[PDB]
Design a protein around this ligand. Structure first.
Ligand SMILES: CC(C)(COP(=O)(O)OP(=O)(O)OC[C@H]1O[C@@H](n2cnc3c(N)ncnc32)[C@H](O)[C@@H]1OP(=O)(O)O)[C@@H](O)C(=O)NCCC(=O)NCCS
Lengths: 293, 293
């Protein structure tokens, strides 16, 4: 690995041993760890243990930010084991507002989209993380999507903004996938999902409705699916839909069971870190509802 | 209708006859209209015709912005006849950069979510509309989705961000809908979609892959579907997906047919103003791809 040199910064490959004590001023800070995936580390020891772990991750490429006067404001770099290239940075309070994150982040992205021969980079910032959302924007990242997430050291889940930047954007891209479901009684299915999944009839044609759309959110666009009346008595071949939801599985589960829908049983925490339960329509279709917790 | 008073502005219900002249400094500007739904009006006469029309919209409710120094920097307000409360605004060149739009936008927004007794407001901004997305961000509007659209007075379609603000946020909201497709050879399907639909594989469980996810975009969260391998013979009931895409159907079509996919035929203009064509997987699954044009 090489070193990143910026206007007034010197980004050098992370050295858990050498960098532990310096970077502990960030990792050890509760004010800084406030938005992180885990609680501030108890000691430079723990920070060493942690930093090592982060650096080990397949794909990881982390640098330690070296200020002009030696000082180490913090680190930046690409995350380990992510699929789609993830960014990450962090600074100690004492360096906030110096445009470091922006300068270091800028270096990492720039390097990644060139010498690192990558296609694009992504940054996951929590909804209220004002300071970090600013850096992202300043760096060239633009909101791509959003996702829920739960940090074990936290009371409840939270919002995550997927902000990214590409080498060259894809003119041809897909905006949504509205899968269809052939149901017996459209009007009846609509009422069920309205209740069980808090959906709302985006539109419907026919009297009674022969075809409709169920928006799973109150907005013009977003998660949703259509319905098609089955012209017959012959049982329908089930369709398996997976719904990424926000909130706690319980709250979702509860809503669904309270809705009088057919629930397979309490929510189960799968190995890929997601609690889920399935809702089965009378036609046989299966909808599994997954939440961070 | 009531007036809205802001820190330093006065928003009075729009008056086509009275405001026409003032507002034509915006509506008559090509600089400004590049981002509007229609070409700059030829004259105050036309602007008056236009304004009157927008004002007639069922549910419309727009205000003319009046600065302390008499002037009218532009208009702002709620759009009419849009199932989901829409926001609109525009300023004449000469007033750009004074926090006007944000001041007026915030007013319209604040009002609608209180005295206007609305549940929420939306704003559809073109992805490249920097100046406008900033205003929307400042006012409190957050990205909710994305949709393509084509303006008759333009060459090709474009992307639109649906940014929203709700009076009260919904706890249990679905984030995404990942429909599953049963295929004979997962790894074969993947190769196909990657080329025909510019997809990319997110994950593939097993070797050869028995279960996988195909992301139709390069980002962490977004439109995508999973593939499940079906063991024995027997047929598979087709699953019909609908894919809202960005770009010209032709370009989309071209790519599909070129990728050697099974295409029913060239794109087709539908009544609901959308051009589409269908790709059929060997299993029989049918995926229709529609675009604004
Ligand atoms: C979007 C548009 C209104 C521009 O708004 P703006 O004038 O850029 O945004 P404001 O009106 O909130 O002015 C903000 C700017 O004024 C500055 N400003 C000056 N005095 C200010 C004050 N007292 N308070 C707040 N901001 C002030 C800000 O610093 C900011 O400068 P910055 O651009 O570098 O951020 C204009 O480009 C336009 O009319 N576009 C076409 C119509 C359109 O955008 N439609 C969108 C679809 S709904």
């Amino acid at each position: 690995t090489a070193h990143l040199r910026t206007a007034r910064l010197e980004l050098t490959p992370l050295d858990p041993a050498a960098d532990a004590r310096h970077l502990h001023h960030a990792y050890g800070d509760e004010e800084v760890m406030r938005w992180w995936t885990r609680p501030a580390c108890a000691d430079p020891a723990e920070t060493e243990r942690y930093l090592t772990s982060c650096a080990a991750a397949p794909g990881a490429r982390l640098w330690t930010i070296r200020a002009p006067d030696g000082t180490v404001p913090g680190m930046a770099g690409l995350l380990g084991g992510t699929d789609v290239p993830g960014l990450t940075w962090l600074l100690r309070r004492d360096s906030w507002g110096h445009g470091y994150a922006t300068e270091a982040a800028a270096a990492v992205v720039g390097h990644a989209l060139e010498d690192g021969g990558l296609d694009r980079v992504e940054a996951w910032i929590e909804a209220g993380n004002r300071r970090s959302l600013a850096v992202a924007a300043r760096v060239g990242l633009t909101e791509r999507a959003r996702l829920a997430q739960h940090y074990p050291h936290r009371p409840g889940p939270h919002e995550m903004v997927v902000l990214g930047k590409a080498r060259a954007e894809e003119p041809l891209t897909t905006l949504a996938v509205i899968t269809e479901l052939p149901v017996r009684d459209v009007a009846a299915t609509l009422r069920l999902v309205e209740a069980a999944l808090g959906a709302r009839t985006a539109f419907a044609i026919g009297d009674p409705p022969e075809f409709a759309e169920a928006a799973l959110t109150p907005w013009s666009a977003g998660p949703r699916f259509r319905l098609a009346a089955v012209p017959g008595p012959g049982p329908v071949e089930p369709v398996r839909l997976h719904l990424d939801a926000a909130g706690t599985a319980d709250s979702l589960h509860r809503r669904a069971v309270d809705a009088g829908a057919r629930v397979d049983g309490p929510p189960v925490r799968r190995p890929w870190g997601r609690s889920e339960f399935v809702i089965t329509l009378p036609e046989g279709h299966e909808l599994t509802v997954s939440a961070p917790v």
